[model samples]
Target: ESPERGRKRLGIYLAHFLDHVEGHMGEIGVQRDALAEDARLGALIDRALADMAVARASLNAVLRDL
Candidate 1:
């Protein structure tokens, strides 16, 4: 069990996980028709989107600094 190799594997796993989460986020953004015309839900989604953006950026930075 090489420590460097384990860290590399962790990075790969996190990369894939982030990509998967992003895919879902993208689809939610695209399929907004279902939630259209609802100001409250729309606001929630927008807020969540913004939160995701910040969180993703932080995660990417952490990965790079790893």
Candidate 2:
């Protein structure tokens, strides 16, 4: 692929991924009871989200660094 095409695709993917995270925050807010009831699942979700935030931040920083 050309450089322009790759840039467009990367922009689209990151936009979509950020949108998902925004929606997920809303869902998590309303689903607290269900999350609390399932300890294992809740922990898993929490850890996954935490890791995602860290990874996303790291990626952003590296992009800016470059």
Q: Say which candidate scores most in TM-score.
A: 1
| Tens digit per residue, CA lDDT, model 2, 5-61 | 877777777767776786886687567547657678787777776787787787666
User: Worst 10-residue stretch by lDDT in candidate 2?
Assistant: 57-66
Q: Write the per-residue lDDT of candidate 1 for residues 1-66, one digit (tens) a residue.
A: 798988799889889988999998898887764775876888888889879989899989867876
Cα-lDDT of candidate 1: 0.84
Q: Candidate 2 regions off by >4 Å?
A: 37-40, 59-66
TM-score of each: 0.81, 0.55
> What's the lDDT for all of these models?
0.84, 0.70
